[PDB]
Amino acid sequence: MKLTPKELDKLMLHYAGELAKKRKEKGIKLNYVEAVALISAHIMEEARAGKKTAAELMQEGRTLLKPDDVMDGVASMIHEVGIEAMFPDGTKLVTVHTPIEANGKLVPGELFLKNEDITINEGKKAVSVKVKNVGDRPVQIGSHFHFFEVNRCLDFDREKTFGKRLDIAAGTAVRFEPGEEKSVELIDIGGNRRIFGFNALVDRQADNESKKIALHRAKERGFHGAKSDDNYVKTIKE
């Protein structure tokens, strides 16, 4: 029976589960592991019998342990239980979300952040800009992305956006449904203000003069809102 290391992994897990079930049975509040296992182990058999579906087990797993079954803290700990089992249609990932609940007051590593708010991008004079997606597909722009160089579909005043990024939480972004129109918030790029890459429009220092070029290239490259070439005077490098 050519046993794949994957299979052994499970055969092990399974019994990790059996112990678990066998313990509460004898009336004992299950802990982190014990819960996790149990939950997991279940799905594995359920997938075996080939009855329940993934969508289902994903849910039914939330009905395996009552808040009075596990130890105080366990509930909060298991944010979720991921486990792949082999269904007649093939292996699948059953992700069981929050299988138990806060029937207790204890929460390991709980957070006591001090109320109040943090101000993103301190003193950074923002600016609003109309932005409509004139394309058939959606477009998500990011925090520190040179807005000016966004997809050649977001129609807006590139000129007003040169050297700036969506004034938002570092990391996140903004979505544009084909057609959708909005007014984004965008502050200037800090640091040395050295734009390099993206759509190859700048690749230099954010200068009011470098700008001329970007605006020119975007025109030729087709980005909506990229003004026009009012008799452009070429430079010796661009």
Partner: protein, 569 residues
């Protein structure tokens, strides 16, 4: 010149010409096209068998005397599904034909001569195939290697540096330092390795060093910023250094759409991952890219084959790959507008039409590192069901289709990353990375994995027993998996540049080390069988995938071959 009955003959030497074999429990029927033996002179080892002194084993061998013979082997390779003896010498496929002892055998070339020095390995009844080559490996954990190995995968090309986020999202081993580490780590394993670099950079300088540092290519990943600039830069350097380049299209479409990405690739060679879409990329089009010439289309893994539970599965995964924390607004919007049951469906069909050419895995990142080969076959069996045989098929069998799905994880990926010279198919001259498959378990559970002409791991039983057959019978590492031996049986691929600069000595690599070549001169037409080009479209609305005009979409399955029938889990 007596004569015997096939009934017998086969149980003695294995399916011969005209005979047909059923691949595993699938409805895929293979048929022995040719046979190099000489009925009456076939090689057999045992008690009073044939392979013995002065008999089938020459006492006057050729000065080529084989190291190992795999007798009576049914070869299923993109080059044909035939019968013959496979010979190994100096860790390579020395010969593929009759072979035995010229002193007593009619047609034995010194190429396949058996002598006192050649070991005997029975193969009659089994199906020998080259090792698979998963090329979309996310080096998240060293434990994948062994698993993938147990599959029928001898070569793993990917990027990464362990369970770090950058790696969990993309297959990229960033920088030459991290490159050192992995190459040095690779030494440990039993599985040819090659690493990819961060194509995500518009800094030519920084882009060239990684290749000079051992990388066999680049990788452009969304999480790192797959912008036309990066895309262009990476591409050019890639040209200069004759190395391959992979890509994970710009999903959010922030910089632009596939129109732009393709425009960036400027027609240059490009190996695309999870082309289909679910694996990631320009929503929704992308998959349409698999129809262009300059593109090296590749399918992810989970979205294959297409079953009732596929779509219900993916919804999560995205989170555990792009750090798409299950909560944020912007996140909980595209992650949903990417798992199109549409693109997912056509895939299978696209794979049948030759629209797709490679079947990755994406190990631990939306893909099962141990289910590449299996799925590739299921997906085949399936398609046959719903579409029946193929127009190109000849005779009462599925040979052609077989040879199509097979080279999807063997000869086609090998070419994709310039290493088709050494490995990727059972052809004389190449590295002896072979795997014997017991027909019943084909496509899922291999008998043994021989690396570099010597057994590295195989099914082994109770180590204490009186024979190797008795349970527990799982896979056990074999000699060519240990000591200095491992060093001799494995190849850690790198670039010419590095090869020439002496990366081997540089990093004290004891492993065999070859350079990748001919990566910029290839195109879609260079993909065996799966060389079909065809302008495809994708309705922005319905999302329906069209090719040449007609519409392609497979029907979801409710059960698949090569599954619960073989693994307790």
């Amino acid at each position: 010149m007596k004569k015997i009955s096939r009934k017998e003959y086969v149980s003695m030497y294995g399916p011969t010409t005209g005979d047909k074999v059923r691949l595993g429990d699938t409805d895929l029927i293979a048929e022995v096209e040719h046979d190099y033996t000489i009925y009456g002179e076939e090689l057999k080892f045992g008690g009073g068998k044939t392979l013995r002194e002065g008999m089938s084993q020459s006492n006057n061998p050729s000065k080529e005397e084989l190291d190992l013979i795999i007798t009576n082997a049914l070869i299923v390779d993109y080059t044909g599904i035939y019968k013959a003896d496979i010979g190994i010498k100096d860790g390579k496929i020395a010969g593929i034909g009759k072979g035995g002892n010229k002193d007593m055998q009619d047609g034995v070339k010194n190429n396949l001569s058996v002598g006192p020095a050649t070991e005997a390995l029975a193969g009659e009844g089994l199906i020998v195939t080259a090792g698979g080559i998963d090329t979309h490996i996310h080096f998240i954990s060293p434990q994948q290697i062994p698993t993938a190995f147990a599959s029928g995968v001898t070569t793993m090309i990917g990027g990464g540096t362990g369970p770090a986020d950058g790696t969990n999202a993309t297959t990229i081993t960033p920088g030459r330092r991290n490159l050192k580490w992995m190459l040095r780590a690779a030494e440990e394993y039993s599985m040819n390795l090659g690493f990819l670099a961060k194509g995500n950079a518009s800094n030519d300088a920084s882009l060239a060093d990684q290749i000079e540092a051992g990388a066999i290519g680049f990788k452009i990943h969304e999480d790192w910023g797959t912008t036309p600039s990066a895309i262009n830069h990476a591409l050019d350097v890639a040209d200069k250094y004759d190395v391959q380049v992979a890509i994970h299209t710009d999903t959010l479409n922030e910089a632009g759409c596939v129109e732009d990405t393709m425009a960036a690739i400027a027609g240059r060679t490009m190996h695309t991952f999870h082309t289909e879409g679910a694996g990631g990329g320009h929503a929704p089009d992308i998959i349409k890219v698999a129809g262009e010439h300059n593109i090296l289309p590749a399918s992810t893994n989970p979205t294959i084959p297409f079953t009732v539970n596929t779509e219900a599965e993916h919804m999560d995964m995205l989170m555990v790959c792009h750090h798409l924390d299950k909560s944020i607004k912007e996140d909980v919007q595209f992650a949903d507008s990417r798992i199109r049951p549409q693109t997912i469906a056509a895939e299978d069909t696209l794979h049948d039409m030759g629209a797709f050419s490679i079947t990755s895995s994406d190990s631990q990142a939306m893909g099962r590192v141990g289910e590449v080969i299996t799925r590739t076959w299921q997906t085949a069996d399936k398609n046959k069901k719903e579409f029946g045989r193929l127009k190109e098929e000849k005779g009462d069998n599925d040979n052609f289709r077989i040879k199509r799905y097979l080279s999807k994880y063997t000869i086609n990926p090998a070419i994709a990353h310039g290493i088709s010279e050494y490995v990727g198919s059972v052809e004389v001259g190449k590295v002896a990375d072979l795997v014997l498959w017991s027909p019943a378990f084909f496509g899922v559970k291999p008998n043994m994995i021989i690396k570099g002409g010597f057994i590295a791991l195989s099914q082994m039983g109770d180590a204490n027993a009186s024979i190797p057959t008795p349970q527990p019978v799982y896979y056990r590492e074999m000699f060519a998996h240990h000591g200095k031996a491992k060093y001799d049986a494995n190849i850690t691929f790198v670039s010419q540049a590095a090869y020439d600069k002496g990366i081997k000595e540089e990093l004290g690599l004891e492993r065999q080390v070859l350079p990748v070549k001919n990566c910029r001169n290839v195109t879609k037409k260079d993909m065996q069988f799966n060389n079909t080009t065809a302008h495809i479209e994708v309705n922005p609305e319905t999302y329906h995938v069209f090719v040449d005009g007609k519409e392609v979409t497979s029907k979801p399955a409710n059960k698949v071959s090569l599954a619960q029938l073989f693994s307790i889990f």
